[PDB]
């Protein structure tokens, strides 16, 4: 999840309806369960992301057919297919999980 | 009490955590003073970053430094607790049986975080609720309770104290436990005779024989 | 009109901030010089860790889609290779915002003459005109201070006579051919040396830049060798090898050849496809093909040894590669082959000729990848741009070779088809100028790219004129596959046989704008270059007739 | 849920760890910053060595505003005594900085031009000392028993690579043997 600005659980998990609704209730209840952990910290977290440590600390992201610009948080990165942003690890973590960024 | 030391202890805790087969006490005294400290510097850097634009009709370095640092240490604890929550996910039952029993130390406000306890009970709840409307309907009368039969078993597992963990022996010498020839500590495995332990050399053994050394932090993992 | 270092400190002060930054440097467009420039530029930014956007623009019309759409916080903008011809102040408009204007658009261009509206009347620039044409250039200087802001009847008549007096000479200016003075890269390096960075791969970027265009003239480049060779003298990896050594291990001077792909292809195929030698030896002809073999009979190089890849040829032939050519080539009139060139050795991988590298990148640009189709195609070129951008990096060589296996193939296409033309004698000498059109051919997919027709057009204008009396006459080409009769037609410039008296200033730029202003029949300047336009087969023929007359040259 | 690895450390994580070790630097520079854990420094004097943490040296090296010192143990003339001392005690693994692999990867990426005779030498040396030492580990690994091992002085990376293996088949081995008495 998914990740900035989560901001809702949607379009994820290609299994969707094919997987049993009994599990999906558990699932939605579970991400609802983790929203509270998100709400205790005050880290900030971003717990969902950054399993792999920052270096260093600016990277280069090459657009991958994404539109864009949807980068509202922090700044309007103005997403544009065939455009690489010499941007800090910060918004890279959040945006790479979605599927916009490609090369770290 | 120094920041650097709280950090060294943070790292120490982090390693000891990812190594050991089982859960460790929740170190609130430190982890909370860091959870206050980062709330301080994250506000401070945004304040100095915003005040910096006023002298602007210079050097971004201490700001970049600072910020990178904060990314690193905000990673560290996030690995920590993201790990512990997993071991809670695996030990939920064991912990439950540990809670219903009197002796010795149950979850309380200590063994788990005031944040973690919520995660534990809610996960446990929604899990039981999942399996309940899924496969127990259709409920065996003996199998109503989730606990030992015994056998096999279930869970119970895994407070596994015999698992191997790489350990590196470090701690202040008085010249407590040093019996020679090089140094501390005992050892005394139950199945075997002492090696015993040498301090400049890492020696892999069971987690149980060393748990007390772990408590004292006389051996890193 | 400014010190490079000071323009730099300006783009420094408006740059670094919270949030960073913001600037979009526009790399444009299809010209290898652009890469050469903006890569050392981008590395320079990464040095001070200044955030940047970098955009692969193809179409000149395409730039409007960008600048008009996404701009928010960007107080300092940078642009490359555009605006020297057509002014963006009118094109973008601007509309002054807030003196001490908030946004500074730097425009870097090698093209001349500058637009009149650009240099004088400072709004968006911050011009890069420095230092090539300063000049004066008194013709643009009197163009404004006179014009602006401009018994009484004779003073009115006198005044107006003066106004037209300035307007005539002014009309001489800005109506003219577009010709590159110096490679933008060179100047970025002049900007770079004042800051104090001597970096080796940087310098290699300069060498790449300069040698981007030697396919087309120099023109000043013949005297650029001091400005490079001295720099190659300002550094050195080791006083003596010390073989290799595995690191530094850098670029050096060698007797390089306009000969094509000597090091990464078989020798015989390296003459047979080379561009300068296509001409003098009449290689499209079967009767001339033999003359090559006679060259090899003169060299004592086996035919079988000529067919073998250059890595593996015998050592004796290598040591004699700089001699045998002296002994023989002189007799065939091929005496201009041996340049003093630059070669960077990566050691155990191989070595690479400055020029051949450029052949690799060009190779990358077109291959190895109703308005929806053209947009999607130009898009494919935009993606492909980065596939070409990556090859510049040292750490990945593995794909650079994917360029070279292409660069060979392209020639094998280009040469082939090129010969397919001369067999039918498709050249129309006309009267005022030479002209051609390809009505049919194999694999027009390769010919979609502007630069492909720049190189085919180049080998062809090079082939027709050795010289080859008389009258170097600019050439025209056309091709069509899909996108409903787009029939791309690129302007060209004559080639002197190494003895070049005048720049000669391609006039198609003007001749096309005269027609866009006349009946404008399906005429599209959409491509960034003034020499190359688009047309439809319906309106191409009346366009060709209106091209024939009135001739501006 | 850490997913990977999870029981062993990640190769990257041990660099994430080692970069917390301080090493000396040669600053070109002449705010504050307190940061948190640094404690340093009063404004660094150009042409004056000082002791700081690694990740900042690396950070300030990307900007080439500082020249890192080479470790006294990283030299080819120094390494020579170490492989000499290693061939001649086939049992013990000698004396290791314990980070030496990972510092050998890290300091070679950027700092390489700072070293005296870095080229085609030290990499040849440590790629060697990372050879005979590795096979010596695989031939010292036949003597496996529960529960003891002397792995003596051994790198963090070397620990991390073989960890799942040893601490897994020790958990199949000791598992039958504890349980058969």
Beta carbons of D27 and D44 less than 8 angstroms apart: yes
Q: Positive or negative CA dihedral for C14, C18, C21, C22?
A: negative
Tokens describing residue C171:
């009309």
Q: Å resolution of this model?
A: 4.8
Test B115 with A40 for CB contact under 8 angstroms: yes
Q: How many CB atoms within 10 Å of residue A94? A: 22
Q: Taking the alpha carbons of D82, D84, D87, D89 in that order, is the dihedral positive or negative?
A: negative
By Cβ distance, the residue of D32, D36, D152 closest to B69 is D36
Please give the residue range of the domain that contains residue B39. 1-157
The answer on B192 and B137 residing in a single domain is no
| Separation CA C260–CA C361 (nearest Å) | 14
Strands A84-88 and A58-62: antiparallel
Residue tagged 């955590």 (tokens): B17
Residue in B with minimal Cα distance to A28: B126
Q: Which of C362, C71, C56 is nearest to A82 (CA)?
A: C56
b or e along B55-89 (b: 16 or more beta carbons within 10 Å of the residue's beta carbon)? eeeeebbebbbbbbbbbbbbbbbbbbbbbbbebbe
Cis omega (within 30 of 0) for bond into D13:
no
Chain C touching partners, 3 or more CB pairs below 8 A: A, B, D
Contacts 24+ apart (CB under 8 A), A66-70: A66/A99, A66/A100, A68/A100, A69/C70, A70/A100
Q: Do A51 and D62 touch (CB under 8 A)?
A: no
Phi, psi (5° rounding) for residue C243?
Answer: -75, 135
Identify whether C136 is preceded by a cis peptide bond (ω within 30 of 0): yes
Per-residue tokens: C498 = 């190494």
Q: Residue D73: name the closest of D29, D21, D137, D110 by CA.
A: D21
Instruction: Give the Å distances, CA to CA, from D35 to A46, B41, C360, C451.
Output: 22, 8, 48, 54
Q: How far apart are CA C426 and CA C278, in angstroms?
A: 18
Which of residues B157, B173, B204 is at a domain's end? B157
Q: Compute the distance between CA of residue B120 and CA of residue B96 in angstroms, rounded to an integer.
A: 10
Q: How many structural domains does chain B have? A: 2
Q: Which residues of B19-49 are buried (b: 16+ CB within 10 A; e: fewer)?
A: bbbebbebeeeebeebbeebeebbeebeeeb
Cα distances (Å, whole numbers) of residue C20 to A56, C140, C526 = 16, 38, 33
Contacts 24+ apart (CB under 8 A), D49-52: D49/D24, D49/D25, D50/D24, D50/D25, D51/D22, D51/D23, D51/D24, D51/D25, D52/D22, D52/D23, D52/D24, D52/D25
- Taking the C-alpha atoms of residue C32 and residue C324, their distance in angstroms, rounded to an integer, is 34
Contacts 24+ apart (CB under 8 A), D2-10: D2/A51, D2/B79, D2/B82, D2/B83, D2/B86, D3/A51, D5/D164, D6/B18, D6/B83, D6/B86, D7/B18, D7/D163, D7/D164, D7/D167, D8/D160, D8/D163, D8/D164, D9/B18, D9/D160, D9/D163, D10/A52
Q: Which stretch of DSSP H or E encloses residue C366? A: helix C354-366
CB contact under 8 A, A33 and B78: no
CA distance C131 to C3: 9
Q: Do residue B110 and residue B188 come from a single domain?
A: no
DSSP state of D88: T
Determine contact, residues C450/C530, Cβ cutoff 8 Å: no
Residues B165 and B121 in one domain: no
Element at C330 (helix H, strand E): helix C324-332
Q: Which residues in chain B have their CB less than 8 angstroms from residue D7's CB?
A: 18
Coil, strand, or helix at residue C8?
helix
For residue C507, CA distances in Å to A27, A85, C180, C518, C531 come to 70, 39, 14, 17, 8
Determine which of C48, C247, C347 to mutate to test the interface with D (most D C-beta atoms within 10 Å): C247
Taking CA atoms, what residue in C is nearest to A87? C51
Which residues of chain B lie closer than 8 angstroms to A30, CB-CB? 123, 126
Cβ-nearest to C70 among A69, A87, A88:
A69
C-alpha distance from C39 to closest chain A C-alpha (Å): 13
Distances (CA, A) of C270 to A77, B99, C299, C451, C495: 47, 82, 15, 21, 21
* Residue C353: its H or E element: strand C350-353
Residues B170 and B102 in one domain: no
Interrupted backbone of chain C, residues before each interruption (C–N > 2.5 Å): 98, 150, 369, 499
Q: Is B165 helix (H, G, I), strand (E, B) or coil?
A: strand
Within C75-208, strands assigned E span: 76-80, 104-108
| Burial class (CB within 10 angstroms; exposed 0-12, middle 13-18, buried 19+) of C143 | buried
Give alpha helix (H) positions in chain D: 11-18, 54-62, 76-87, 100-109, 122-140, 156-179
> Across the interface, do C18 and B57 touch by the CB < 8 Å criterion?
no
Are D163 and B62 an interchain contact pair (Cβ–Cβ within 8 Å)?
no
Cis bond upstream, residue D147 (ω within 30): yes
Cβ-based burial of D127 (10 A; exposed 0-12, middle 13-18, buried ≥19): exposed
The verdict on D62 touching C (C-beta cutoff 8 Å) is yes
The residue among B19, B46, B67, B31 whose CA lies nearest residue B163 is B19
CATH of the domain at B147: 1.20.58.1030
Question: Do residues C265 and C403 make contact, with C-beta atoms less than 8 angstroms apart?
Answer: no
Q: Output the DSSP codes for C52-81.
A: EEEEE---HHHHHHHHHH--SS--EEEEES
| Chain center to CA of B193 | 30
Candidate from B66, B164, B191 with C-beta closest to D33: B66
Q: Which two tokens stand for residue B220?
A: 């890193």
Total length of chain D:
181
Q: How far apart are alpha carbons C338 and C328 in whole angstroms? A: 13
Nearest in space to C129 (alpha carbons), one of C239, C3, C16:
C3
Candidates A8, A58, D146; CA nearest to C20 is A58
The answer to whether C48 contacts chain D (CB < 8 Å) is yes
Cα of first residue to Cα of last residue in chain D, in angstroms, is 37
CB B16 within 8 A of CB B220: yes
Q: Which two tokens stand for residue D106?
A: 């890290």
User: Which of C17, C18, C75 is the best substitution to test chain B (most B C-beta atoms within 10 A)?
Assistant: C18
Distances (CA, A) of D94 to B181, C520, D97, D133: 19, 84, 10, 10
Beta strands B219-220 and B168-169 are antiparallel
Contact C505, C473 (CB under 8 A): no
Q: Which residue on chain C is closest to D121 by alpha carbon? A: C246
Burial status of residue C138 (CB atoms within 10 A of its CB: 0-12, 13-18, 19 or more): exposed
**Contacting residues of A for B77, CB less than 8 Å apart:** 43
Closest CA to C86 of C373, C389, C516: C516
- For residues D153 and D96, the answer to whether their CB atoms sit within 8 Å is yes
Measured between CA atoms, the residue of chain B closest to residue C50 is B60
CA-CA distance, B85 to B207, in Å (whole number)?
Answer: 21
Q: What angle do CA B183, B187, B192 make, to 5 degrees?
A: 130
CA angle (D79, D82, D87) in 5-degree steps: 130
Those of residues 37-96 in A touching chain B at CB distance below 8 A are: 37, 40-47, 50-51, 53-54, 56-57, 89-90
Q: Which domain-ending residue is among B133, B157, B181?
A: B157
What is the maximum alpha-carbon separation in chain C? Answer: 91
User: Which among C33, C1, C8 is positioned nearest to C23, based on CA atoms?
Assistant: C8
Q: What number of other Cβ atoms are within 10 A of residue C398's Cβ?
A: 8
| Alpha carbons within 13 A on the beta-carbon side of C132 | 26
**B49 inside 8 A of chain C by CB:** yes
Q: Which residue, of B136, B157, B178, is where some domain finishes? A: B157
Asked if omega into C113 is within 30° of 0 (cis), the reply is yes
Locate C272 and state its tokens: 């047979």
The reply to whether B67 and B147 lie within a common domain is yes
Both tokens of B221, joined, read: 């993992």
> B187, B202, B206, B210: which to substitute to probe chain D, counting the most D Cβ within 10 Å?
B202
Provide the CA C481 distance to its chain's centre, in angstroms: 25
Indicate whether B71 and B144 sit together in one domain.
yes
Provide residues of B within 8 Å CB-CB of chain A: 35, 38-39, 42, 64, 67-68, 71-72, 74-75, 77-79, 81-82, 85, 115, 118-119, 122-123, 126-127, 129-130, 133-134
Hey, what are A40's tokens?
């205790």
Interface test with C, best of D119, D121, D124, D127 (most C CBs within 10 A): D119
Both B84 and B48 in a single domain? yes
* Coil, strand or helix at D73: coil
**Could you tell me what percentage of chain A is helix, strand and coil, using 3-state DSSP and rounding each to the nearest 5?**
25, 10, 65
Q: Any idea how long chain B is?
A: 221
> Given an 8 Å threshold on Cβ–Cβ distance, is C49 in contact with D62?
yes
- What phi-psi label fits residue C93: left (phi over 0), alpha (psi between -120 and 50 degrees) or beta? left
Is the sign of the CA dihedral B126, B128, B133, B134 positive or negative?
positive
- Which of D36, D154, D171, D181 is the best residue to mutate to test the B interface, defined by the most B CB atoms within 10 Å of its own CB? D36
Long-range contacts of residues C512-515, Cβ cutoff 8 Å, at least 24 apart: C514/C552, C515/C543, C515/C546, C515/C547
Determine whether the interchain pair B18/D7 forms a contact, defined as Cβ–Cβ distance below 8 Å.
yes
* Chain C residue whose CA is closest to D120: C246
CB distance A82–C52 less than 8 Å?
A: no
3-state secondary structure of C340: coil
* Cα–Cα distance measured from residue C398 to residue C403, given in angstroms and rounded to the nearest whole number: 10
Distances (CA, A) of C468 to C97, C282, C290, C337: 57, 12, 20, 18
User: Which alpha helices (DSSP H) does chain A contain, by range?
Assistant: 21-40, 89-96
CA of B53: which chain C residue's CA is closest?
A: C17
Task: List Cα–Cα distances, C371 to B201, C48, C198, in angstroms.
Answer: 72, 41, 46
Residue D72: helix, strand or coil by DSSP? coil
Chains in contact with D via at least 3 Cβ–Cβ pairs below 8 Å: A, B, C
Question: CA B137 from chain center: how many Å?
Answer: 37
Asked if B75 and A50 come within 8 Å (Cβ–Cβ), the reply is: yes
3-state secondary structure of D126: helix
Q: With an 8 Å Cβ cutoff, are C48 and D63 in contact?
A: yes
Partner-chain residue, chosen from B38, B67, B133, that has the shortest CB–CB distance to A43: B38
Beta bridge partners of C219: none
**Could A37 and B130 be called an inter-chain contact, meaning their C-beta atoms sit closer than 8 Å?**
no
Q: Residue C219 carries which DSSP code?
A: S
Q: Are residues B148 and B175 in the same domain?
A: no
Structure tokens given for C130: 């420095």
Q: Are A47 and B81 inside 8 Å of each other by CB?
A: yes
Instruction: Tell me whether residues C13 and B57 touch, CB distance under 8 A.
Output: yes
Phi, psi of C550 (to 5 degrees): -90, 130
Whether residue A86 lies within 8 A of chain D, CB to CB, comes out as no
Distance from CA of D132 to the nearest CA of C (A): 24
Say if the Cβ atoms of A26 and B129 lie within 8 Å: yes
Indicate the SS3 state at residue B194: coil
Residue matched to tokens 């005031």:
B114
Closest-CA distance, C450 to chain A, in angstroms, reads: 20
What strand order describes the sheet that includes D50-53?
D50-53, D22-27, D66-68
Alpha carbon of C153 to those of C123, C160, C164: distances in Å? Answer: 37, 10, 17
Helices (H), chain B: 3-19, 28-51, 61-100, 116-134, 207-216
**Cβ distance of C247 and D119 shorter than 8 Å:** yes
In which residue are the tokens 């600390």 written?
A: A57
C-alpha angle C436/C474/C115, rounded to 5°? 120
Cα separation, C35 vs C389, whole angstroms: 7
Mutate to test the interface with D, among B59, B64, B166, B182 (most CBs of D within 10 A): B166
The verdict on B1 touching C (C-beta cutoff 8 Å) is no
- Residue D87: Cβ-neighbour burial (10 angstroms; 0-12, 13-18, 19+): exposed
Question: Partners for B (CB, 8 Å, 3+ pairs)?
Answer: A, C, D
Closest-CA residue of chain C to D63: C47
User: Residue A76: closest CA among chain C residues belongs to which residue?
Assistant: C72
For residue A22, CA distances in Å to B135, C251, C492, C509 come to 11, 67, 70, 70
For residues C319, C324, C327, C330, the Cα torsion angle rounded to the nearest 10 degrees is: -120
Give the torsion sign (CA, C218, C220, C226, C231). negative
Residues B135 and B169 in one domain: no
Q: How many CB pairs under 8 A join A and D?
A: 11
Identify whether residues B41 and B69 lie together within a single domain: yes
Give me the phi and psi of B168, to 5 degrees please.
-115, 120
CB atoms C46 and A86 under 8 Å: yes
Alpha helices in C391-436 (DSSP H): 400-422
The answer to whether residues B69 and B172 belong to one domain is no
Instruction: List the one residue out of C322, C220, C309 whose CA is nearest residue C267.
Output: C309
């Amino acid at each position: 999840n998914g990740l900035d600005l989560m901001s809702s659980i949607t379009f994820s998990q290609q299994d969707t309806n094919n997987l049993s609704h009994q599990e999906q209730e558990y699932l939605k209840e579970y991400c609802d369960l983790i929203t509270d952990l998100k709400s205790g910290d005050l880290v900030d977290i971003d717990l969902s992301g950054s399993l792999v440590p920052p270096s260093d600390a600016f990277i280069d992201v090459r657009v991958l057919k994404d539109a864009g610009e949807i980068q509202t948080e922090y700044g309007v990165f103005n997403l544009i297919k065939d455009s690489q942003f010499f941007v800090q690890q910060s918004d890279v973590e959040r945006l790479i999980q979605q599927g916009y960024l490609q090369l770290i | 009490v120094s920041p650097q030391q709280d950090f060294s202890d943070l790292m120490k805790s982090w390693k000891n955590e990812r190594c050991s087969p089982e859960l460790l006490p929740y170190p609130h005294q430190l982890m909370k003073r860091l959870l206050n400290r980062i709330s301080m510097q994250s506000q401070l850097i945004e304040n100095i970053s915003m005040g910096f634009l006023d002298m602007q009709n210079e050097s971004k370095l201490p700001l970049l430094c600072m910020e990178t640092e904060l990314e690193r240490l905000k990673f560290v604890i996030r690995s920590y607790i993201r790990c512990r929550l997993s071991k809670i996910d695996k030990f939920s039952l064991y912990l439950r049986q540990l809670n219903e029993d009197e002796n010795s130390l149950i979850s309380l406000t200590d063994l788990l975080s005031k944040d973690e306890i919520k995660y534990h009970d809610t996960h446990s709840l929604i899990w039981l609720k999942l399996v309940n409307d899924s496969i127990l309907k259709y409920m065996p009368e003996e199998l109503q309770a989730i606990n030992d039969t015994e056998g096999s078993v279930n869970m119970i597992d895994e407070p596994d104290w015999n698992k191997f963990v790489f350990i590196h022996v470090n701690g202040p010498p008085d010249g407590e436990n040093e019996f020679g020839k090089p140094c501390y500590t005992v050892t005394i495995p139950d199945l075997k005779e002492e090696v015993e332990l040498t301090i400049g050399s890492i020696y892999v053994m069971r987690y149980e024989v060393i748990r007390d050394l772990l408590r004292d932090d006389k051996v890193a993992l | 009109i400014s010190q490079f270092s000071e323009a730099y400190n300006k783009i420094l002060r408006n740059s670094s901030s919270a949030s960073s930054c913001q600037l979009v440097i526009f790399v444009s467009c299809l010209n290898i010089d652009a890469l050469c420039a903006t890569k050392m530029l981008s590395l320079l930014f990464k040095k001070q860790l200044v955030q940047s956007q970098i955009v692969p623009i193809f179409g000149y019309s395409e730039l409007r889609r960008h600048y008009s759409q996404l701009d928010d916080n960007i107080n300092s903008l940078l642009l490359v290779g555009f605006g020297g011809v057509i002014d963006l102040e009118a094109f973008l408009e601007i509309d002054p915002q807030e003196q001490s204007f908030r946004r500074d658009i730097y425009v870097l261009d090698a093209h001349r003459p500058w637009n009149l509206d650009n240099i004088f009347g400072s709004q968006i620039i911050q011009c890069f005109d420095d230092g090539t044409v300063d000049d004066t250039l008194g013709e643009e200087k009197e163009a404004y201070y006179k014009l602006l802001e401009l018994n009484d009847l004779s003073k009115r008549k006198q005044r107006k006579k003066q106004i037209h007096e300035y307007e005539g000479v002014l009309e001489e200016y800005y109506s003219q051919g577009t010709t590159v003075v110096n490679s933008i890269s060179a100047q970025i390096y002049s900007l770079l040396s004042a800051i104090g960075e001597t970096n080796l791969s940087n310098l290699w970027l300069n060498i790449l830049g300069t040698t981007s265009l030697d396919i087309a003239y120099a023109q000043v480049y013949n005297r650029l060798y001091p400005l490079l060779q001295d720099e190659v003298k300002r550094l050195t990896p080791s006083s003596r090898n010390s073989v290799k050594t595995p690191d530094t291990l850098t670029l050096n001077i060698q007797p390089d050849y306009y000969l094509f792909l000597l090091r990464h292809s078989s020798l015989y195929d390296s003459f047979y496809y080379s561009n300068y030698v296509n001409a003098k030896l009449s290689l499209w002809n079967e009767n001339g093909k033999k003359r090559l073999h006679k060259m090899f009979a003169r060299m004592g190089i086996p035919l079988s040894t000529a067919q073998e890849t250059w890595l593996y040829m015998d050592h004796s032939i290598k040591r004699e590669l700089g001699i045998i050519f002296d002994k023989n080539l002189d007799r065939y009139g091929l005496q201009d082959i041996i340049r003093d060139g630059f070669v960077r050795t990566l050691g155990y991988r191989g070595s690479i000729s400055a020029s051949e590298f450029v052949e690799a990148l060009t190779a990358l640009l077109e291959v190895g990848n109703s308005a929806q189709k053209l947009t999607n195609l130009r898009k494919r070129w935009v993606s492909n741009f980065w596939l070409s951008w990556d090859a510049l990096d040292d750490r990945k060589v593995e794909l650079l070779n994917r360029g070279i296996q292409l660069a060979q193939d392209l020639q094998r296409a280009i040469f082939n088809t090129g010969v397919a033309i001369l067999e039918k004698k498709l050249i129309k000498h006309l009267r005022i100028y030479r002209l051609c059109v390809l009505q049919d051919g194999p694999d027009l997919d390769l010919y979609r790219n502007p630069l492909t027709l720049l190189r085919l057009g180049n080998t062809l204008i090079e082939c027709c004129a050795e010289s080859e009396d008389k009258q170097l006459l600019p050439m025209v080409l056309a091709s069509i596959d899909e996108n409903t009769d787009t029939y791309l037609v690129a302007g060209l410039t004559p080639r002197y046989p190494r003895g070049t008296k005048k720049p000669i200033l391609n006039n198609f730029s003007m001749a096309f704008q005269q027609i866009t202003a006349e009946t404008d029949a399906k005429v599209r300047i959409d491509n960034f270059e003034s020499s190359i336009i688009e047309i439809r087969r319906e309106d191409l023929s009346p366009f060709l007739e209106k091209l024939t007359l009135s001739g501006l040259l | 849920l850490p997913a990977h690895l999870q029981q062993t450390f990640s190769p990257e994580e041990i660099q994430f760890i080692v970069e917390n070790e301080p090493i000396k630097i040669f600053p070109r520079i002449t705010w504050q910053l307190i940061t948190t854990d640094d404690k340093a420094l009063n404004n660094m004097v150009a042409m004056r060595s000082t002791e700081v943490v690694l990740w900042i040296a690396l950070l300030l090296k990307q900007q080439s505003k500082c020249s890192i010192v080479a470790p006294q143990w990283l030299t080819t003339k120094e390494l020579d005594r170490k492989i000499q001392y290693e061939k001649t005690h086939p049992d013990r693994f000698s004396e290791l900085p314990w980070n030496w692999l990972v510092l050998a990867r890290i300091l070679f990426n950027k700092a390489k031009d700072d070293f005296h005779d870095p080229i085609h030498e030290l990499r040849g040396k440590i790629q060697d000392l990372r050879e005979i030492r590795q096979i010596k580990v695989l031939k010292g690994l036949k003597y496996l028993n529960e529960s003891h091992l002397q792995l003596d002085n051994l790198s963090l990376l070397e620990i991390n690579e073989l960890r799942p293996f040893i601490t897994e088949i020790m958990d199949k081995l000791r598992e039958i043997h504890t349980a058969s008495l």
